[PDB]
Design a binder for this molecule. Sequence first.
Ligand SMILES: Cc1ncccc1N[C@H](C)CS(C)(=O)=O
Length: 103
Amino acid sequence: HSDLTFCEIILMEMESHDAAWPFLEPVNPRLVSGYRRIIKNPMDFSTMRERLLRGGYTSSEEFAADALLVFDNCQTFNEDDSEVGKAGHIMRRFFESRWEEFY
Ligand SMILES: Cc1ncccc1N[C@H](C)CS(C)(=O)=O
């Protein structure tokens, strides 16, 4: 149980983070030229939240893979000095730090 209890804590903390604004909703491929072609597996916090709320995470490791996918996608599509990239680096360091705090 407490495995998925912490996932809720960490997800809510990412959701409310100052740097979370790029990752709150799915990227809109109609607005982001090239996104569909380059990113094979989109992921974002609201999709993780939908999946966490109706039970679809078997372990904490499934949840972490989705979190890391958000930031791997961010680094694949966005330059490191771009505004989305800088936000994603903050969010990625936040997630890894908070996740290791725990396990
Ligand atoms: C996470 C990400 N990655 C690549 C470009 C943009 C983004 N974030 C945007 C906020 C998504 S939007 C609303 O479609 O423009």
